[PDB]
Design a binder for this molecule. Structure first.
Ligand SMILES: Cc1cc(/C=C/C#N)cc(C)c1Nc1ccnc(Nc2ccc(C#N)cc2)n1
Lengths: 412, 554
């Protein structure tokens, strides 16, 4: 009932971000949702004296046919005062990633029971546009914590902690983490009661006040990690050897002991690319010494909460994608590889958009924050289509790579 | 008295920190003052303004301007300073409806709402900032001090607050009359519907009855305006629209301005006049801060302009949108990075037309441009009709599949069908994925002396073939490309080329079919002539075979 005062960062004004074009179907969905949210007091129409704006659109989550309103609070978030609650900043649960399984629950609705600081409301303004802008856009602002806003979990934290004590005390080994509108619940108990502990947690939540019906399971215990491997062949052509030296030269930026002298020696002369070259003793030993080196972990690799996480993605073709997460170049903290028949066999962008969400989810579980993406796609193509395939309540940052990375194959 | 609902006022504030205006009222003439005194007395009687005490310390200069020697005078309150100090507003007046997005309405009534503008109260706590003074005759008495009670014309927040106030009132009427449309444009309200002129007049009578509730009267109007309407540069007709007449200027001496002003017209016309080109005419204007420069038209521009006038010969109209029929978009390659498109529902009856120009860059490819044009039409179509149109493109299904499955970037074109109208977009060459058996292997390389700019490019092959060419005014980058070019020129139809140039690979892997660099173009031209080309990369200075930097190090 009482509201916790909020303000932007000293010297910054509220967001003034343009609403992007929405399809007729998304507009209709938003009008219906916002009309209902207005009857419920969650939002209120605003006048022209409010100049701020945050983009809005609509999505359909994991296997449901019901539209969800998603506000793109990325700008408002980086302008919202770092919210240091009475939590001292909950030290990210380094054990969530080790847990056998993890289910992700959408508890954003809970936020709608807490009122928002009146002086801050103006900053959450958004517009439902009209097709061809025939009528003026419907302008609204929030009266309660908005889903997707940084301050929502922070402000509702105190309320959330006491709503779960019965469970946390009843189940001491289950790890529960909260990121934005998501609650990540991890335990080693097999689906049977892991599902029921959630179902128990759902009821427990449904009873303690608060589409919760949805669940999203992950297995961080069996996640995609990636060591560098070299070919094992009985006959090497000149081309095979040139590719190997190129790859080892690349890895030498990651691993110091890598040597190619003995292998490139085999390349002394202008030979036909398809000619088979027998490996010398020295070269074969160098290859063995390099294989061993590649089995040890990368040296001096540590995570740093004060720095951004950077995620690079490469299109490998045939539905496969590789990615690396790091903070320092050549100091990978996590690498992976994807390929699935999930509604995008002829859609490159749908696949990339799905990869972006899995990588972000993985990043939240491991470090408690989202990475900055470097996407192998032209800005105009991505910005035109990503919202058609987005199914998450959060949205990461991204930039575009326009020059083909020579290091593509070395990752697959 | 019939009680009338009041128009809610909008809380206005000055920007943070800033204070109201305090500008010197300038000396006026005896007759102008008498003029202003009259005007202001009358405005006061109507409620628009009110005399204020000497307390208020704010001030905005007022002026007197004669409406071109007519039997009248006009007051001009210069709110420029006050505007610099007024908070920002939600200018809900942005991105106008595009005529092609409108629906047909056989009946369009116009209602005048000039007197409604003042029916809009100015936030009480803000009025004082609008204070102004009519100087006194001979400055022998204190000037008459006034302040606004209504939105002042020329004030920063007037447009926004009026539209928002008018919308809020019309809202309930529009919502309960889903078969009529209303548009605010200047002192008028245009109400359209597609009802029998009978059921339409009733609806207009109802709007007037509804507006009366707020005390707003519209002179009984079948406005001095009837189809076709001149609006936002267009001509809106009952069942069709077009841009207002485009008249291409006739001259022998074209200057910077005349030319770019020729651009704007062509650009405005391109939304309905098919195939318009502006690449050459726009080409000539990069470097013009000076506008009087009598610049010559390259023979290209003259041909383009001739193709322009021709298309402008016949008047062209676009139709309105019918939500029951499909939306289709067709594109054509025009050459020199130019593309044209038409969006329609029925063949030969376009809703609108348009064009696209390649983005500035050194290397490019037709498929990438076709894709960008598709993205642009998609977004514009989402804006105008709330949906993506079905595309008809001059590219074979097979060409597209080969393209996107092999392109290093993710890419996508929405639902589309091939339309066989030359020139077709195609892939000009396709590099090999594996080294070619039996094909000669060329090890190439180049290097240049950074100081002298002297360099060399060349190759050695597995057959012993060799070449080294000395070069002047060159760089490492150019020599690496030259080396690749020599290998291509001197090899048979199938060839394997080994290079250590990350730069050249960066270019070739981007798959360009055209370039600004004549050296990349010569290479592309050679690629097109080959049957098979395998380009392999190796690290430089790693003692890797044939990578003869030495031959070029000289
Ligand atoms: C944008 C707009 C400008 C004017 C006019 C402004 C001015 N001046 C008048 C109206 C009523 C509208 N609004 C809409 C909304 C939907 N369909 C249409 N179709 C439509 C509009 C005009 C004519 C005509 N003639 C025919 C069909 N108009």
């Amino acid at each position: 009932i009482e509201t916790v005062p909020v303000k932007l960062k000293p010297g910054m004004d509220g967001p003034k971000v343009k609403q992007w074009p929405l399809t007729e179907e998304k507009i209709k969905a938003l009008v219906e949702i916002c009309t209902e949210m207005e009857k419920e007091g969650k939002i209120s129409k605003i006048g022209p004296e409010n100049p701020y704006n945050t983009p809005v659109f609509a999505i359909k989550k994991k296997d449901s046919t019901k539209w969800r309103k998603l506000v793109d609070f990325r700008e408002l978030n980086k302008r919202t005062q770092d919210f240091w609650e009475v939590q001292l900043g909950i030290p990210h649960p380094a054990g969530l990633k080790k847990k056998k399984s993890v289910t992700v629950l959408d508890v954003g609705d809970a936020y709608f029971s807490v009122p928002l600081d009146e002086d801050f409301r103006k900053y959450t303004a958004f517009t439902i546009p009209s097709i061809n802008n025939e009528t003026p856009g419907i302008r609204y602002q929030y009266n309660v914590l908005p889903q997707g806003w940084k301050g929502s979990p922070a402000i509702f934290q105190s309320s959330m902690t006491k709503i779960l004590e019965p469970f946390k005390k009843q189940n001491p080994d289950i790890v529960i983490y909260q990121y934005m509108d998501d609650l990540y619940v991890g335990s080693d108990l097999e689906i049977g009661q892991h599902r029921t502990k959630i179902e128990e947690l759902r009821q427990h939540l449904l009873r303690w006040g608060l589409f919760l019906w949805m669940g999203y399971e992950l297995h961080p215990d069996k996640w995609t990690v990636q060591p560098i491997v070299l070919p094992e062949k009985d006959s090497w052509t000149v081309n095979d050897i040139q590719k190997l030296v190129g790859k080892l030269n690349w890895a030498s930026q990651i691993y110091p002991g890598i040597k190619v002298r003995q292998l490139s020696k085999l390349l002394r002369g202008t030979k036909a690319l398809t000619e088979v070259i027998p490996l010398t003793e020295e070269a074969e030993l160098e290859l063995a010494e390099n294989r061993e080196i590649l089995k040890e972990p990368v040296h001096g690799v540590y995570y740093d909460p004060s720095k951004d996480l950077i995620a690079e993605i490469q299109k490998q073709g045939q539905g496969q994608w590789t990615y690396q997460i790091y903070q320092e170049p050549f100091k990978n903290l996590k690498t992976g590889k994807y390929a699935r028949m999930r509604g995008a066999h002829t859609n490159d962008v749908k696949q990339l958009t799905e990869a972006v969400q899995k990588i972000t989810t993985e990043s939240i579980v491991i470090w408690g924050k989202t990475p900055k993406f470097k996407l192998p796609i032209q800005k105009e193509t991505w910005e035109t289509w990503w919202t058609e395939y987005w199914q998450a309540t959060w949205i990461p940052e991204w930039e575009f790579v326009n020059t083909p990375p020579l290091v593509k194959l070395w990752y697959q | 008295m019939v009680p009338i609902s009041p128009i809610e006022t909008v809380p206005v504030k000055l920007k943070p920190g800033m204070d109201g205006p305090k500008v010197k009222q300038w000396p006026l003439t005896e007759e102008k003052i008498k003029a202003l005194v009259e005007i202001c007395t009358e405005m006061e009687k109507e409620g628009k303004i009110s005399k204020i005490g000497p307390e208020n310390p704010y001030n905005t200069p007022v002026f007197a301007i004669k409406k071109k020697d007519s039997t009248k005078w006009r007051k001009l309150v210069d709110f420029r300073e006050l505007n610099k100090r007024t908070q920002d507003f939600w200018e809900v007046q942005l991105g106008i409806p595009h005529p092609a997005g409108l629906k047909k309405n056989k009946s369009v009534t116009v209602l005048d709402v000039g007197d409604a503008y003042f029916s809009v109260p100015l936030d009480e706590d803000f009025r004082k900032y609008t204070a102004f003074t009519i100087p006194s005759i001979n400055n022998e008495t204190p000037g008459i001090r006034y302040q606004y009670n209504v939105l002042p014309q020329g004030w920063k927040g007037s447009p926004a607050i009026f539209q928002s106030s008018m919308t809020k009132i019309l809202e309930p009427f529009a919502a309960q009359n889903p078969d009529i449309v209303i548009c605010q444009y200047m002192d008028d309200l245009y109400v359209g519907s597609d009802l029998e002129i009978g059921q339409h007049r009733t609806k207009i009578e109802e709007l007037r009855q509804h507006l009366l509730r707020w005390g707003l009267t519209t002179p009984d109007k079948k406005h001095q305006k009837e189809p076709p309407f001149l609006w936002m540069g267009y001509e809106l007709h009952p069942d069709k629209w077009t841009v207002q007449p485009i008249v291409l200027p006739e001259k022998d001496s074209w200057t910077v301005n005349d030319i770019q002003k020729l651009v704007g017209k062509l650009n405005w016309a391109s939304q309905i006049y098919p195939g318009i080109k502006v690449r050459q005419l726009s080409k000539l204007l990069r470097g013009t801060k000076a506008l009087t420069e009598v610049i010559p038209l390259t023979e290209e521009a003259e041909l383009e302009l001739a193709e322009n006038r021709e298309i402008l010969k016949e008047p062209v109209h676009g139709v309105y949108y019918d939500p029951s029929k499909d939306l289709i978009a067709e594109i054509q390659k025009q050459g020199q990075g130019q593309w044209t498109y038409q969006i329609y529902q029925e063949p030969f009856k376009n809703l609108k037309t348009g064009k696209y120009a390649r983005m500035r860059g050194a290397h490019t490819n037709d498929v990438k441009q076709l894709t960008e044009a598709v993205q642009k039409i998609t977004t514009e179509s989402i804006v105008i009709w709330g949906k993506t149109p079905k595309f008809k493109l001059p590219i074979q299904k097979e060409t597209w599949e080969t393209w996107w499955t092999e392109y290093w970037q993710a890419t996508w074109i929405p639902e589309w069908e091939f339309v066989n109208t030359p020139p077709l977009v195609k892939l000009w060459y396709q590099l090999e994925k594996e080294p070619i058996v039996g094909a000669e292997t060329f090890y190439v390389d180049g290097a240049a002396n950074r100081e002298t700019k002297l360099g060399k490019a060349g190759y050695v092959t597995n057959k012993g073939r060799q070449k080294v060419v000395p070069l002047t005014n060159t760089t490492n980058q150019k020599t690496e490309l030259q080396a690749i070019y020599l290998a291509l020129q001197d090899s048979g139809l199938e060839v394997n080329i080994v290079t250590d140039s990350q730069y050249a690979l960066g270019i070739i892997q981007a798959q360009p079919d055209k370039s600004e660099s004549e050296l990349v173009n010569q290479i592309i031209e050679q690629l097109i002539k080959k049957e098979k080309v395998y380009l392999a990369w190796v690290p430089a200075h790693k003692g890797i075979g044939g990578n003869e930097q030495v031959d070029k190090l000289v």
